[PDB]
Amino acid sequence: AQIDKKIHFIWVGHIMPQKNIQVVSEWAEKNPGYETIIWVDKKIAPAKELDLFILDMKSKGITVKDINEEGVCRDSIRHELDQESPNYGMVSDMLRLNILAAEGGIYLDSDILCSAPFPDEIYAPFGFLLSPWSQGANNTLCNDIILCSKGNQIIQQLADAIEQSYIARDSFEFTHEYASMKETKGERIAKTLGVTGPGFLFHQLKKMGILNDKSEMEAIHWELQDQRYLIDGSVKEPDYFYVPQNNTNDASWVPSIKRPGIENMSFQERLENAVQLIAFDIQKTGLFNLDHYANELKVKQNSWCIAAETSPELKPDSYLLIRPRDKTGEWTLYYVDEDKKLNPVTLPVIKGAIKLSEVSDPLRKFHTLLSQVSDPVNPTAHELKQIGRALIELKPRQDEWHCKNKWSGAEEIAQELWQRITSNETLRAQIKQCFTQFESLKPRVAELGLE
Ligand SMILES: O=c1ccn([C@@H]2O[C@H](COP(=O)(O)OP(=O)(O)O)[C@@H](O)[C@H]2O)c(=O)[nH]1
Ligand SMILES: [Mg+2]
Known part of the structure; x- marks a missing residue:
């Protein structure tokens, strides 16, 4: 069956980083016969920033789809997304299978470069293909490249199995390879790889008989398998994929970070x-x-707001950042204290001998960040993202300007x-x-x- 002419990327949480967008843009441009789609979750996204992102993607001719609107977000996936600190690796692992079942096509991570365009038609004997290549390594198993025809039964079985694996995550025991993996890689990485990642995939493919008795976790031996499950029906390195040695993958899901707006x-x-x-x-x-x-x-991290002027309502014990009326004007940062008093946060103009305290001052680092905003009246999603991040974690040396976070x-x-x-x-x-x-x-x- 033919692989549907869609290329699917996933990014949930905050806004997709610039590097990733550039990668997606390259895939889209190099594969014009395919519809390139970025999948997002509107329910946990920062609404203003996501709106800017979607408009940007429209301008680049990239389709954006919402997981909820398209009906591909199972309850189990919603469950992870609504955690205060989602494991976006687990979410993405689960989503890619549900997207592929629903639409068919080609799932790719956005930390893989395109070194050659896909064929205009890809015909898959079993309606499902994997890559023998991942993260710059050949003859390996990974889940960052997956192809199928819409409604493929192997993909559907994997989607069901990964849901069950995820639901059972808190019964997951660090045994076999995972005992070792916990020690080497750490608990978060080990559990992810075993529950939704290439570990899960390995075991599920073995149970399904897609990998035979000669295949092992750290020695897949594709050359001993049925190579009709592989792109171009071969264990040879595919032309399509490239990563440099100094950045084989991003590991972007590994940090445990609060999802947007928890602090507010x-x-x-x-x-x-x-x-x-x-x-x-x-x-x-x-x-x-x-x-x-x-x-x-x-x-409880710092509560914060970026606004054009004093919001219709002030949040006690928070930061309020006010953009200038003109692109040349200065920003105004207020600490809104517990009694909703606007306390202006200012810095003296310095020159001459550099004070080593001032170069290491949180507030001056913040001021520098604001000065690098291209248009203060119309900041980009990435600018708003970075400013928000700074505000969430801002800890002034002045206690008078420090959030209490009781x-x-x-x-x-x-x-x-x-x-x-x-x-x-x-x-x-x-x-x-x-x-x-x-x-x-x-x-x-x-x-x-x-x-
Ligand atoms: O904030 C984040 C971080 C990661 N991801 C998802 O996690 C996937 C895997 O991330 P990455 O490629 O960095 O991981 P690695 O390949 O190094 O395991 C990405 O493609 C995204 O779909 C996400 O949605 N939001
Ligand atoms: Mg990756």
């Missing part, structure tokens, strides 16, 4: 988010890590989560295990165990 949400909003996520865990597995949710919820402790939050969950009679009855290391809550987990 109300406690009650965040709490209810956690409650719904826990409810899903309980319904699907009967098991939830209470500490995961509590340890996320306790984090917030509940993890244990108190966990107690509240426990009460709300266990007060639901249906949920209570569905709990089989609860992971907690909170001293006040271990007892309550024992109490329910008796019941």
Whole structure:
């Protein structure tokens, strides 16, 4: 069956970095017979920045599709996306299979360069193709290049299996190769690779009989497999893909970062988010890590806003950044204190002998960042992204200009989560295990165990 003439990229969370956009643009330009599509999630995205991004992509002739609008976001995927710190690797691993089932075509990571265009028609014997090449290595297994015909059954089976793998993530034991991988690569990377990544894929392909007994995790031996599953039906290096030695991959999902706007949400909003996520865990597995949710919820970074002028309503204990009326004018940063007083954050004009404190000053670094904005009246999505990032993490030496970020402790939050969950009679009855290391809550987990 013919591979549908679509090239699919995924970027969820904040806005796709410039480097990645350049890569996508190159793929689009070099493969004009294919529709190039960037997939996003509008539900967690920063709305203003995403709007700018979409308009930009339209101007470059790149289609943007939303995972929710197209119906490719399973509940399990929504579940990871709505976490306060999503594993975007897991999300992307799951989404690519659902997109391919729905539309067919070619999934690519945006950290692979195009060294040759695809054939105008690709005909796949089993409606499904993998690359023997990944991250500059030949005769390997990876999941960053996947081709199929719309509605392919292998792709559909993989999508179902990865959903089950993900749902079972908190029962995942670091054994076999993963015991080692935990030690070498760390817990986050090991678990990702095993649950949704090339580890998951390896085991699923073996179960399906697509890889035979001669194939091993770290020695796939494509030359001993059915090469009709491979692009161009061969283990030979494909012409299409290139990476330089000094950047074989981006590992962009590895940092654990809060999703957009967490720091600006109300406690009650965040709490209810956690409650719904826990409810899903309980319904699907009967098991939830209470500490995961509590340890996320306790984090309060700086609240912030970028506006044209004093917002119709001020947020107490936050930063408010005001753009100039003209492209030449200076920005104004305010610390909005707990009583909603605008405290202007300013710096003296310095020259002559350089003070080593001032070069290392958070506020001067911030000021420098603002000065490099091309058009203060019309900042780009990436500019807004960088300024927001700076504001979230800004820690002035002046206590008068420092956000207080007064917030509940993890244990108190966990107690509240426990009460709300266990007060639901249906949920209570569905709990089989609860992971907690909170001293006040271990007892309550024992109490329910008796019941
Ligand atoms: O903030 C992020 C980081 C990563 N990703 C997704 O994660 C995929 C894999 O990232 P990367 O290629 O950097 O990982 P690596 O190939 O090094 O494992 C990307 O293509 C995106 O779909 C995402 O959506 N948002
Ligand atoms: Mg990659």
